[PDB]
Amino acid sequence: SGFRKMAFPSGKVEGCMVQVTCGTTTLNGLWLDDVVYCPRHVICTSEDMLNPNYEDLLIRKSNHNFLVQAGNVQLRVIGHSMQNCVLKLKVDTANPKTPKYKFVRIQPGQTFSVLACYNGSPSGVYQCAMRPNFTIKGSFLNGSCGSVGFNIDYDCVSFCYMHHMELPTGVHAGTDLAGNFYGPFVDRQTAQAAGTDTTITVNVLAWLYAAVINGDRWFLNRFTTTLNDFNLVAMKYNYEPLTQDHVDILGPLSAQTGIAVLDMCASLKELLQNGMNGRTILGSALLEDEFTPFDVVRQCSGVTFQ
Amino acid sequence: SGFRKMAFPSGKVEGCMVQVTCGTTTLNGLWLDDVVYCPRHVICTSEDMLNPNYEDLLIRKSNHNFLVQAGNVQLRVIGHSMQNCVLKLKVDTANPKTPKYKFVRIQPGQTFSVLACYNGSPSGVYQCAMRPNFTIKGSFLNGSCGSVGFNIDYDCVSFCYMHHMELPTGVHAGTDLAGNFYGPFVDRQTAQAAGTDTTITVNVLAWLYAAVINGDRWFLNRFTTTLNDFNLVAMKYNYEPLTQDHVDILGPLSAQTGIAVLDMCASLKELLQNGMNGRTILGSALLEDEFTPFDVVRQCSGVTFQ
Ligand SMILES: *[C@H](O)[C@H](C[C@@H]1CCNC1=O)NC(=O)[C@H](CC1CCCCC1)NC(=O)[C@@H](NC(=O)OCc1cccc(Cl)c1)C(C)C
Ligand SMILES: *[C@H](O)[C@H](C[C@@H]1CCNC1=O)NC(=O)[C@H](CC1CCCCC1)NC(=O)[C@@H](NC(=O)OCc1cccc(Cl)c1)C(C)C
């Protein structure tokens, strides 16, 4: 037993991290087969950032302007292209450590592991959620751009995030691996703000099922509630609406604990209305929303990857 | 910016995990050079667990009783020995993925990353502390024994923990990699209990410095306090004593934030006496104690590993 904020094992991704240098800018890139993916603002200069036109910054570069380090080995760029907000640098060598992989664009509420990197070298791994406002609450310093977020499914790495920038509230914005920003953000140093965030209700319910699986039951109660009456309470406390689809997804957890989804909703209602009153759940004094139903089942039943 | 419960990149350790099977028992082992390390209770049978004498369970085994899987490859055991509570299986093949490594026995309060594994395959990674009562609050199911805890220092993996058993409060006990239990625990299924735990005070102070580095300052105040007067408050709230040595270790953080250690202690005092009163620190509504001063500096300045 026990319940931890668990990240996927990171080795498959560590083998893909490289350093990309252009001008005075160094960041991380992702080397899969013979292509290195990285944020396109690597081609920006210090004066170039209020309203850059990337289609030249790029038409003005030559391949030899791109310095790619794979550890103790320089990789030669033989071509470059831009796809939305990511650069793709064609190099003359295929990454022999290339895992089985997919690029996926995730929905808000979905979680993923982030391998934070500087100068092509991994620094740490942690677990994140895509917030409803399409930011992630990450841990990123200068040089971490191009670090990627990912999930692993048996043997396949599904990359879903690459890091680009930090917003004034200290939260983070980036793209999928095909270069499309999550949320309304753009890669230009102009006024931008996160927008109002909300709590991921289906994930909170999943984490309460995790708690029950692990022996915390103090928050359960008699009651039930309807979906409508639950969603009226959620909306006051700035929680995302719970859909019938969320309910079905919570089915396996409901069935394993014997607590109907709508009963767990009644418990969450009283937690929102009364608070926790000096008690904790799974070592937390807040309602945690960065575990999906799948994360809970994965961690509480022991799914592996190879 | 941002602050996350960060684990070390796990790839160097993933390359060392193997499956060990003996009789009806399957668990994980750690394959470094030509030796596989695993818990010695792998040689116990279902009837053998109330007071086993391992010196035979072992004298009765032959090498061919040990089934070791390195993925799709069976490893042949050519020798075995017991060191305290770990088995060492000499195999005929050296692990080519063997990193630079050390075995270290850590002090309570020190943190480490755990690569949770089942059947030799990694399941997830997370960050733990050795509690003052020498348990760890892990996430472990049947089959996770032999999963290891570790730190990374530039290029070197310092292994510090291997998992053995779960105590009735849902917390976990195990050994260093030379087989010595942390705490008073023994590998026999007889009555054992964790003992009273306490909060790791030096780590709480480090996490408050992390908060200041990251823009949470609401908890700072006028006051100062003496070490003695702080420790009188800590003892009432079941906190570990703060030593002058802890104070010196907190020096770099003190110097980077401009907040004297003893001033941060005055802040922690008021947090203990008044609570947080509906406010959070670094996304937590509790005082967090599983970041060391070194973790804070590592994450807030961007140290990497290669
Ligand atoms: C890349 O490694 C780096 C990572 C961040 C640095 C600190 N934490 C990070 O996650 N990214 C950056 O430094 C970007 C540079 C590019 C260059 C031009 C194209 C877009 C950004 N800069 C930022 O993240 C800055 N934030 C930012 O510009 O956000 C929008 C914005 C713009 C103007 C004015 C405001 Cl108030 C906000 C950071 C302030 C460094
Ligand atoms: C190995 O993969 C497994 C991992 C644990 C299973 C559930 N979570 C885990 O971390 N370890 C075990 O199953 C051990 C087996 C050995 C075999 C004999 C030598 C010592 C233990 N068993 C346990 O962890 C059990 N706990 C336990 O025995 O703790 C002390 C104890 C003993 C007697 C009575 C009490 Cl109340 C407590 C678990 C209960 C499975």
PDB file of N, CA and C in Angstrom, chain A residues 189-251:
ATOM      1  N   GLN A 189       7.286  37.547 -26.453  1.00  0.00           N
ATOM      2  CA  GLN A 189       7.381  38.137 -25.093  1.00  0.00           C
ATOM      3  C   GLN A 189       6.486  39.376 -24.956  1.00  0.00           C
ATOM      4  N   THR A 190       5.168  39.238 -25.186  1.00  0.00           N
ATOM      5  CA  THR A 190       4.107  40.257 -25.067  1.00  0.00           C
ATOM      6  C   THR A 190       3.168  39.831 -23.939  1.00  0.00           C
ATOM      7  N   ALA A 191       2.292  40.749 -23.539  1.00  0.00           N
ATOM      8  CA  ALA A 191       1.428  40.541 -22.382  1.00  0.00           C
ATOM      9  C   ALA A 191       0.567  39.298 -22.548  1.00  0.00           C
ATOM     10  N   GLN A 192       0.732  38.343 -21.637  1.00  0.00           N
ATOM     11  CA  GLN A 192      -0.085  37.144 -21.627  1.00  0.00           C
ATOM     12  C   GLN A 192      -0.290  36.691 -20.192  1.00  0.00           C
ATOM     13  N   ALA A 193      -1.485  36.178 -19.911  1.00  0.00           N
ATOM     14  CA  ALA A 193      -1.824  35.732 -18.569  1.00  0.00           C
ATOM     15  C   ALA A 193      -2.639  34.449 -18.641  1.00  0.00           C
ATOM     16  N   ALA A 194      -2.504  33.647 -17.579  1.00  0.00           N
ATOM     17  CA  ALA A 194      -2.925  32.249 -17.595  1.00  0.00           C
ATOM     18  C   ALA A 194      -4.427  32.064 -17.809  1.00  0.00           C
ATOM     19  N   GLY A 195      -5.256  32.988 -17.348  1.00  0.00           N
ATOM     20  CA  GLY A 195      -6.679  32.726 -17.290  1.00  0.00           C
ATOM     21  C   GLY A 195      -7.059  31.921 -16.054  1.00  0.00           C
ATOM     22  N   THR A 196      -8.339  32.016 -15.682  1.00  0.00           N
ATOM     23  CA  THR A 196      -8.811  31.459 -14.417  1.00  0.00           C
ATOM     24  C   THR A 196      -8.738  29.939 -14.421  1.00  0.00           C
ATOM     25  N   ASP A 197      -8.057  29.376 -13.440  1.00  0.00           N
ATOM     26  CA  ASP A 197      -8.001  27.928 -13.385  1.00  0.00           C
ATOM     27  C   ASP A 197      -9.122  27.380 -12.510  1.00  0.00           C
ATOM     28  N   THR A 198      -9.364  26.082 -12.655  1.00  0.00           N
ATOM     29  CA  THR A 198     -10.413  25.365 -11.951  1.00  0.00           C
ATOM     30  C   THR A 198      -9.842  24.028 -11.488  1.00  0.00           C
ATOM     31  N   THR A 199     -10.531  23.381 -10.547  1.00  0.00           N
ATOM     32  CA  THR A 199     -10.055  22.109 -10.028  1.00  0.00           C
ATOM     33  C   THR A 199     -10.604  20.949 -10.860  1.00  0.00           C
ATOM     34  N   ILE A 200      -9.750  19.952 -11.126  1.00  0.00           N
ATOM     35  CA  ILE A 200     -10.137  18.817 -11.967  1.00  0.00           C
ATOM     36  C   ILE A 200     -10.956  17.788 -11.183  1.00  0.00           C
ATOM     37  N   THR A 201     -12.282  17.940 -11.228  1.00  0.00           N
ATOM     38  CA  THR A 201     -13.180  17.202 -10.334  1.00  0.00           C
ATOM     39  C   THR A 201     -13.051  15.684 -10.482  1.00  0.00           C
ATOM     40  N   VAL A 202     -13.017  15.179 -11.717  1.00  0.00           N
ATOM     41  CA  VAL A 202     -12.924  13.729 -11.885  1.00  0.00           C
ATOM     42  C   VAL A 202     -11.638  13.185 -11.246  1.00  0.00           C
ATOM     43  N   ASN A 203     -10.566  13.967 -11.259  1.00  0.00           N
ATOM     44  CA  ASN A 203      -9.330  13.495 -10.656  1.00  0.00           C
ATOM     45  C   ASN A 203      -9.413  13.489  -9.132  1.00  0.00           C
ATOM     46  N   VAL A 204     -10.065  14.497  -8.537  1.00  0.00           N
ATOM     47  CA  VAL A 204     -10.260  14.513  -7.086  1.00  0.00           C
ATOM     48  C   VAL A 204     -11.007  13.264  -6.639  1.00  0.00           C
ATOM     49  N   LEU A 205     -12.054  12.890  -7.375  1.00  0.00           N
ATOM     50  CA  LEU A 205     -12.823  11.699  -7.038  1.00  0.00           C
ATOM     51  C   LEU A 205     -11.959  10.458  -7.154  1.00  0.00           C
ATOM     52  N   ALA A 206     -11.101  10.406  -8.182  1.00  0.00           N
ATOM     53  CA  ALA A 206     -10.203   9.269  -8.325  1.00  0.00           C
ATOM     54  C   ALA A 206      -9.257   9.165  -7.136  1.00  0.00           C
ATOM     55  N   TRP A 207      -8.745  10.307  -6.663  1.00  0.00           N
ATOM     56  CA  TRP A 207      -7.818  10.321  -5.539  1.00  0.00           C
ATOM     57  C   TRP A 207      -8.518   9.956  -4.236  1.00  0.00           C
ATOM     58  N   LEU A 208      -9.826  10.237  -4.128  1.00  0.00           N
ATOM     59  CA  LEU A 208     -10.593   9.783  -2.970  1.00  0.00           C
ATOM     60  C   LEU A 208     -10.788   8.272  -3.003  1.00  0.00           C
ATOM     61  N   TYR A 209     -10.986   7.699  -4.200  1.00  0.00           N
ATOM     62  CA  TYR A 209     -10.974   6.242  -4.338  1.00  0.00           C
ATOM     63  C   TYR A 209      -9.609   5.666  -3.984  1.00  0.00           C
ATOM     64  N   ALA A 210      -8.531   6.329  -4.413  1.00  0.00           N
ATOM     65  CA  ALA A 210      -7.210   5.903  -3.971  1.00  0.00           C
ATOM     66  C   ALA A 210      -7.131   5.870  -2.451  1.00  0.00           C
ATOM     67  N   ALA A 211      -7.629   6.915  -1.796  1.00  0.00           N
ATOM     68  CA  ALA A 211      -7.615   6.961  -0.341  1.00  0.00           C
ATOM     69  C   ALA A 211      -8.348   5.766   0.257  1.00  0.00           C
ATOM     70  N   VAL A 212      -9.534   5.453  -0.269  1.00  0.00           N
ATOM     71  CA  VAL A 212     -10.292   4.327   0.267  1.00  0.00           C
ATOM     72  C   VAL A 212      -9.522   3.033   0.047  1.00  0.00           C
ATOM     73  N   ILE A 213      -8.956   2.858  -1.155  1.00  0.00           N
ATOM     74  CA  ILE A 213      -8.161   1.661  -1.423  1.00  0.00           C
ATOM     75  C   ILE A 213      -7.070   1.516  -0.382  1.00  0.00           C
ATOM     76  N   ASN A 214      -6.576   2.643   0.140  1.00  0.00           N
ATOM     77  CA  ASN A 214      -5.437   2.651   1.046  1.00  0.00           C
ATOM     78  C   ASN A 214      -5.802   2.832   2.518  1.00  0.00           C
ATOM     79  N   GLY A 215      -7.084   2.833   2.871  1.00  0.00           N
ATOM     80  CA  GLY A 215      -7.493   2.755   4.264  1.00  0.00           C
ATOM     81  C   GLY A 215      -7.994   4.038   4.905  1.00  0.00           C
ATOM     82  N   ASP A 216      -7.863   5.199   4.248  1.00  0.00           N
ATOM     83  CA  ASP A 216      -8.525   6.436   4.681  1.00  0.00           C
ATOM     84  C   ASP A 216      -9.996   6.357   4.303  1.00  0.00           C
ATOM     85  N   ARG A 217     -10.883   6.286   5.292  1.00  0.00           N
ATOM     86  CA  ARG A 217     -12.306   6.292   5.004  1.00  0.00           C
ATOM     87  C   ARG A 217     -13.064   7.366   5.765  1.00  0.00           C
ATOM     88  N   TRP A 218     -12.375   8.200   6.548  1.00  0.00           N
ATOM     89  CA  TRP A 218     -13.047   9.099   7.477  1.00  0.00           C
ATOM     90  C   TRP A 218     -14.006  10.057   6.790  1.00  0.00           C
ATOM     91  N   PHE A 219     -13.823  10.299   5.497  1.00  0.00           N
ATOM     92  CA  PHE A 219     -14.591  11.296   4.769  1.00  0.00           C
ATOM     93  C   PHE A 219     -15.832  10.724   4.097  1.00  0.00           C
ATOM     94  N   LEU A 220     -16.034   9.408   4.131  1.00  0.00           N
ATOM     95  CA  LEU A 220     -17.232   8.812   3.540  1.00  0.00           C
ATOM     96  C   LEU A 220     -18.471   9.194   4.379  1.00  0.00           C
ATOM     97  N   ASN A 221     -19.688   8.981   3.835  1.00  0.00           N
ATOM     98  CA  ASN A 221     -20.924   9.359   4.542  1.00  0.00           C
ATOM     99  C   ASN A 221     -22.115   8.524   4.036  1.00  0.00           C
ATOM    100  N   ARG A 222     -23.261   8.632   4.738  1.00  0.00           N
ATOM    101  CA  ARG A 222     -24.587   8.179   4.234  1.00  0.00           C
ATOM    102  C   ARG A 222     -24.811   8.547   2.780  1.00  0.00           C
ATOM    103  N   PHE A 223     -24.630   9.808   2.449  1.00  0.00           N
ATOM    104  CA  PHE A 223     -25.535  10.372   1.481  1.00  0.00           C
ATOM    105  C   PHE A 223     -25.188   9.882   0.092  1.00  0.00           C
ATOM    106  N   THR A 224     -26.088  10.188  -0.816  1.00  0.00           N
ATOM    107  CA  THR A 224     -25.827  10.199  -2.226  1.00  0.00           C
ATOM    108  C   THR A 224     -26.161  11.598  -2.721  1.00  0.00           C
ATOM    109  N   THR A 225     -26.003  11.795  -4.020  1.00  0.00           N
ATOM    110  CA  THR A 225     -26.414  13.036  -4.646  1.00  0.00           C
ATOM    111  C   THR A 225     -26.650  12.729  -6.110  1.00  0.00           C
ATOM    112  N   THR A 226     -27.394  13.606  -6.764  1.00  0.00           N
ATOM    113  CA  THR A 226     -27.520  13.494  -8.205  1.00  0.00           C
ATOM    114  C   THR A 226     -26.361  14.224  -8.874  1.00  0.00           C
ATOM    115  N   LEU A 227     -26.123  13.882 -10.140  1.00  0.00           N
ATOM    116  CA  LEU A 227     -25.117  14.597 -10.920  1.00  0.00           C
ATOM    117  C   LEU A 227     -25.404  16.094 -10.949  1.00  0.00           C
ATOM    118  N   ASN A 228     -26.642  16.465 -11.290  1.00  0.00           N
ATOM    119  CA  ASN A 228     -27.034  17.870 -11.310  1.00  0.00           C
ATOM    120  C   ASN A 228     -26.747  18.549  -9.980  1.00  0.00           C
ATOM    121  N   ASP A 229     -27.231  17.969  -8.879  1.00  0.00           N
ATOM    122  CA  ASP A 229     -27.039  18.616  -7.586  1.00  0.00           C
ATOM    123  C   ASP A 229     -25.566  18.636  -7.193  1.00  0.00           C
ATOM    124  N   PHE A 230     -24.794  17.636  -7.614  1.00  0.00           N
ATOM    125  CA  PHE A 230     -23.362  17.719  -7.357  1.00  0.00           C
ATOM    126  C   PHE A 230     -22.743  18.861  -8.149  1.00  0.00           C
ATOM    127  N   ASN A 231     -23.050  18.938  -9.447  1.00  0.00           N
ATOM    128  CA  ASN A 231     -22.465  19.975 -10.296  1.00  0.00           C
ATOM    129  C   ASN A 231     -22.861  21.385  -9.860  1.00  0.00           C
ATOM    130  N   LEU A 232     -24.037  21.562  -9.234  1.00  0.00           N
ATOM    131  CA  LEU A 232     -24.358  22.873  -8.653  1.00  0.00           C
ATOM    132  C   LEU A 232     -23.391  23.230  -7.532  1.00  0.00           C
ATOM    133  N   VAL A 233     -22.958  22.241  -6.742  1.00  0.00           N
ATOM    134  CA  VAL A 233     -21.996  22.502  -5.671  1.00  0.00           C
ATOM    135  C   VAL A 233     -20.603  22.730  -6.241  1.00  0.00           C
ATOM    136  N   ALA A 234     -20.208  21.921  -7.233  1.00  0.00           N
ATOM    137  CA  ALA A 234     -18.886  22.042  -7.845  1.00  0.00           C
ATOM    138  C   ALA A 234     -18.663  23.437  -8.413  1.00  0.00           C
ATOM    139  N   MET A 235     -19.694  23.985  -9.053  1.00  0.00           N
ATOM    140  CA  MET A 235     -19.563  25.250  -9.758  1.00  0.00           C
ATOM    141  C   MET A 235     -19.283  26.387  -8.778  1.00  0.00           C
ATOM    142  N   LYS A 236     -19.886  26.334  -7.580  1.00  0.00           N
ATOM    143  CA  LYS A 236     -19.600  27.350  -6.564  1.00  0.00           C
ATOM    144  C   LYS A 236     -18.154  27.284  -6.087  1.00  0.00           C
ATOM    145  N   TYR A 237     -17.589  26.086  -5.986  1.00  0.00           N
ATOM    146  CA  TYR A 237     -16.233  25.943  -5.494  1.00  0.00           C
ATOM    147  C   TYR A 237     -15.213  25.902  -6.616  1.00  0.00           C
ATOM    148  N   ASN A 238     -15.584  26.357  -7.816  1.00  0.00           N
ATOM    149  CA  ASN A 238     -14.644  26.501  -8.927  1.00  0.00           C
ATOM    150  C   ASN A 238     -14.077  25.145  -9.353  1.00  0.00           C
ATOM    151  N   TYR A 239     -14.925  24.130  -9.366  1.00  0.00           N
ATOM    152  CA  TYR A 239     -14.559  22.809  -9.838  1.00  0.00           C
ATOM    153  C   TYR A 239     -15.110  22.603 -11.241  1.00  0.00           C
ATOM    154  N   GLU A 240     -14.391  21.823 -12.040  1.00  0.00           N
ATOM    155  CA  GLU A 240     -14.873  21.484 -13.370  1.00  0.00           C
ATOM    156  C   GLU A 240     -16.169  20.684 -13.268  1.00  0.00           C
ATOM    157  N   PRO A 241     -17.027  20.759 -14.275  1.00  0.00           N
ATOM    158  CA  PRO A 241     -18.238  19.938 -14.237  1.00  0.00           C
ATOM    159  C   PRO A 241     -17.878  18.465 -14.344  1.00  0.00           C
ATOM    160  N   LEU A 242     -18.621  17.635 -13.623  1.00  0.00           N
ATOM    161  CA  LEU A 242     -18.510  16.193 -13.770  1.00  0.00           C
ATOM    162  C   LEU A 242     -19.518  15.724 -14.811  1.00  0.00           C
ATOM    163  N   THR A 243     -19.039  14.993 -15.812  1.00  0.00           N
ATOM    164  CA  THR A 243     -19.899  14.492 -16.872  1.00  0.00           C
ATOM    165  C   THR A 243     -20.258  13.036 -16.608  1.00  0.00           C
ATOM    166  N   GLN A 244     -21.293  12.568 -17.299  1.00  0.00           N
ATOM    167  CA  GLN A 244     -21.615  11.148 -17.252  1.00  0.00           C
ATOM    168  C   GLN A 244     -20.423  10.320 -17.705  1.00  0.00           C
ATOM    169  N   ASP A 245     -19.648  10.855 -18.648  1.00  0.00           N
ATOM    170  CA  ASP A 245     -18.470  10.157 -19.145  1.00  0.00           C
ATOM    171  C   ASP A 245     -17.424   9.989 -18.049  1.00  0.00           C
ATOM    172  N   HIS A 246     -17.188  11.044 -17.259  1.00  0.00           N
ATOM    173  CA  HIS A 246     -16.336  10.925 -16.076  1.00  0.00           C
ATOM    174  C   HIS A 246     -16.837   9.824 -15.157  1.00  0.00           C
ATOM    175  N   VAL A 247     -18.156   9.769 -14.952  1.00  0.00           N
ATOM    176  CA  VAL A 247     -18.760   8.769 -14.065  1.00  0.00           C
ATOM    177  C   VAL A 247     -18.430   7.365 -14.549  1.00  0.00           C
ATOM    178  N   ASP A 248     -18.657   7.099 -15.842  1.00  0.00           N
ATOM    179  CA  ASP A 248     -18.336   5.787 -16.408  1.00  0.00           C
ATOM    180  C   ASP A 248     -16.858   5.447 -16.239  1.00  0.00           C
ATOM    181  N   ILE A 249     -15.976   6.416 -16.492  1.00  0.00           N
ATOM    182  CA  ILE A 249     -14.532   6.208 -16.330  1.00  0.00           C
ATOM    183  C   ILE A 249     -14.187   5.823 -14.899  1.00  0.00           C
ATOM    184  N   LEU A 250     -14.906   6.374 -13.923  1.00  0.00           N
ATOM    185  CA  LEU A 250     -14.733   6.052 -12.514  1.00  0.00           C
ATOM    186  C   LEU A 250     -15.375   4.721 -12.125  1.00  0.00           C
ATOM    187  N   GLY A 251     -15.927   3.986 -13.089  1.00  0.00           N
ATOM    188  CA  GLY A 251     -16.600   2.732 -12.831  1.00  0.00           C
ATOM    189  C   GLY A 251     -15.740   1.660 -12.190  1.00  0.00           C
TER     190      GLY A 251
END
